């Protein structure tokens, strides 16, 4: 098989069931890989933890738009 | 294991078809989460690449043991 298919894939198997205030969020990445059960967003919190969220939710999309304007090297 | 299923979970959906030379390997992680399709091992190379491998294969078990004995499977 092509070696690219043996790269590990991160997925969100559940998503958080309530809004996270944006002050606690630092950045996000998107999950779109077809091996995963659904498209999702991984937020990284200010405390450095990762939490899955559903981009079908308005609070998630609104949070991503704000986070697009900040970064941390 | 992670405390919540709302934390992302990394899985291996396919495994590499040949050994990765041991001199290139830095560390590994065992994948055992019930959400993944099968138990697997992810090797990390010195150039930071991550590669899924089948833990039933002798080269995989031997490589884990080598990384355990020389580096305690850690690169701080």
Swiss-Prot record, chain B:
Cysteines paired by S-S bonds: 11-36, 12-52
Modification sites for Pyrrolidone carboxylic acid: 1
Superkingdom: Eukaryota
Official protein name in the record: C-C motif chemokine 8
Species: Homo sapiens (Human)
Gene behind this protein: CCL8
Full-protein interval shown: 24 to 99 of 99
